[PDB]
Design a protein around this nucleic acid. Structure first.
Ligand SMILES: O=c1[nH]c(S)nc2[nH]cnc12
Length: 266
DNA sequence: CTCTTTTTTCTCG
DNA sequence: GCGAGAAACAAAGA
């Protein structure tokens, strides 16, 4: 999941589980609770979910006044709301049981994580990760963006994927953003001119906000419609609608990369 | 059979 | 520090 999918999930969870008391917490895979499963179980049980927030691709459960549960879904994490008599499925790892249902976390690849953090430790937590600003006109300052790009010789695609320039892009939407802004994914950032940087900046906010509005690209968060709007990602060999040009796939710093070479030259 | 594909952290050199 | 890319892991596919 990338930011739009994670934001979709956050909204669905906000509608359903906020206000509910955690009756118990059970795990078949406690290793994904990085801060310690017994501790999390002991602290959160009996507490009421007060809210759900998000920061980049991180979910933040506000549980009680003093605790935050930071969940990351990584590559394949999925939440679903189920009745209490629901059977366990093969890649279900964690369950948060309420009086009238349960929240189950599943993850085929077991990459996803849970971290129990104090409320006053949430900002330090994200500072330590050097998470960049949220992809909004209010938070995503073009000038800071411009300066970070000029001071770096990194390739633009892997630099955007680092979460430090701006939070929330993953492989899908970075490919889409660079196509939209007509920038080659291997372009060194200190080579970008001001006008490209401006378009890139606006593109990042436009693509992500549109994907959020369409419910993301597609068990919560599975009814998204952004996958019909994708111009390049996963469309290797198809047309760019540029006079017969086709989408190429390459590897960039180990990641599959879809782009239109005709439109995205260095 | 083998190897490659599909977020963040970590290791290498 | 760098930057690339394998590994945490599973499953599918070539
Ligand atoms: O069909 C098109 N062909 C080309 S070469 N460029 C375009 N820009 C928008 N549509 C087109």
């Amino acid at each position: 999941p990338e930011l739009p999918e994670v934001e979709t999930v956050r909204r669905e969870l906000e509608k359903r589980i906020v206000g509910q008391k955690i009756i118990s917490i059970e795990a078949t895979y406690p290793r994904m609770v990085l801060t310690g499963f017994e501790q999390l179980k002991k602290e959160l049980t009996g507490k009421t979910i007060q809210g759900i927030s998000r920061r980049g691709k991180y979910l933040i459960f506000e549980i009680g006044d003093d605790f935050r549960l930071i969940s990351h879904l990584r590559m394949e994490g999925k939440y679903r709301l189920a009745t209490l008599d629901a059977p366990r499925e093969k890649h279900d790892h964690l369950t948060m049981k309420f009086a009238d249902g349960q929240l189950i976390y599943a993850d085929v690849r077991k990459f996803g994580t849970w971290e129990l953090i104090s409320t006053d430790q949430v900002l330090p937590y994200f500072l330590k990760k050097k998470i960049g600003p949220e992809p909004t006109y209010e938070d995503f300052d073009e000038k800071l963006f411009r300066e970070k790009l000029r001071k770096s010789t990194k390739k633009i695609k892997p630099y955007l994927l680092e979460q430090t320039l701006v939070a929330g892009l993953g492989n899908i939407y970075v490919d889409e953003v660079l196509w939209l802004a007509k920038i080659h994914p291997e372009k060194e950032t200190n080579q970008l001119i001001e006008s490209s940087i401006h378009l890139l900046h606006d593109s990042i906010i436009e693509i992500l906000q549109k994907a959020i509005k369409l419910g993301g690209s597609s068990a919560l968060g599975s009814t998204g419609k952004m996958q019909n709007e994708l111009q390049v990602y996963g469309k290797t060999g198809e047309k760019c609608s540029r006079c017969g040009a086709e989408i190429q796939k390459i590897k960039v710093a180990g990641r599959g990369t879809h782009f239109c070479p005709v439109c995205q030259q260095k």
